[PDB]
Amino acid sequence: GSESDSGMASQADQKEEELLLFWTYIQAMLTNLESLSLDRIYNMLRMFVVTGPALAEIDLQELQGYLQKKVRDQQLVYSAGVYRLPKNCS
């Protein structure tokens, strides 16, 4: 029962909500499936980006830069060339 949680920007709404959807995949994915290559979640985001008008399809720098941000926010843990969520803070 959630509807009004989108805001009003007349442009940036869709974008935030598309990226938040992508994060709804990768967050809930790594919550249990806590071990996957960038290429796996890349293939998934790109599937759900091409199926709709989501950003008119993203790019490497966007998706890689998304992971990069998460790591630099400490909201992603980079293992040995493989991504997983910090299910522990410390």
Partner: protein
Amino acid sequence: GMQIFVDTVQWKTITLEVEPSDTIENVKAKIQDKEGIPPDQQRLIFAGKQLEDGRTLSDYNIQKESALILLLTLR
């Protein structure tokens, strides 16, 4: 001697059939029935949209060989 934790992961795709005139509740119920997939515990997103029970397959335009993602309990 010493113990080990063996983490069994099942990351895999399943295949089923469905009709356009069926509701979404039937899809989540039939994967629950067959595979033991708990619908609310494992939240579904189809083609980049979250599924409302009250809607039909045709409502979202479920074409053939279409892919659904199953995300386990997040929040």
